[PDB]
Amino acid sequence: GTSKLKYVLQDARFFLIKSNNHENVSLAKAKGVWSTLPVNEKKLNLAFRSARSVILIFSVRESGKFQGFARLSSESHHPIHWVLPAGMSAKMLGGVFKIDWICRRELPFTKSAHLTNPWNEHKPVKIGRDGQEIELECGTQLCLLFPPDESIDLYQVIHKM
Numbered sequence: 800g801t802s803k804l805k806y807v808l809q810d811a812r813f814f815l816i817k818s819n820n821h822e823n824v825s826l827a828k829a830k831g832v833w834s835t836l837p838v839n840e841k842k843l844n845l846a847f848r849s850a851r852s853v854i855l856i857f858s859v860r861e862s863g864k865f866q867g868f869a870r871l872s873s874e875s876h877h878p879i880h881w882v883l884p885a886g887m888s889a890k891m892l893g894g895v896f897k898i899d900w901i902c903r904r905e906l907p908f909t910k911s912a913h914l915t916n917p918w919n920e921h922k923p924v925k926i927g928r929d930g931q932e933i934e935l936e937c938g939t940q941l942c943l944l945f946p947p948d949e950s951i952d953l954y955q956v957i958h959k960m
């Protein structure tokens with residue numbers, strides 16, 4: 800069913816989150832954590848206090864796909880063995896957000912071509928800088944396009960709201 804998913808997404812806020820590589824998404828899926836640069840850390844902390852659910856929709860750069868989506872379960876807090884771009888130190892990251900995965904399945908950009916994001920000039924939702932907010936209706940429809948992830952039980956996530 801899709802009803803518990805719709806409940807989690809009710810009045811949620813949504814953000815497009817990019818990853819430099821697949822390894823960091825794999826680590827995030829295994830450990831339930833994410834980290835960003837300080838600019839997006841501030842945005843996500845403000846949103847976490849502001850809304851019943853904050854949803855991160857992940858896309859590895861140049862992959863042509865989204866790799867899943869998760870709900871923030873905490874504000875950022877201050878070692879995870881991230882695989883960082885050349886020249887980047889771990890000291891350049893903000894804190895660590897805890898996340899609960901809602902779907903670990905992928906969705907190719909070709910399947911979201913009918914959805915536009917009002918907060919990025921109504922461009923297709925796949926288009927946006929890291930941290931771009933996705934308006935509620937667009938974000939809800941995007942999440943509902945993903946294949947169902949029958950390995951996840953949203954009962955536990957609902958209790959955290």
Ligand SMILES: CN(CC1=NC(=O)NC(=O)C1)Cc1ccsc1
Nearest residue numbers: 817818819823834835836881929
């Ligand atoms: C786990 N982090 C991967 C990310 N990659 C990215 O492009 N944006 C992010 O919020 C997070 C570490 C990091 C942060 C800026 S580069 C590499």
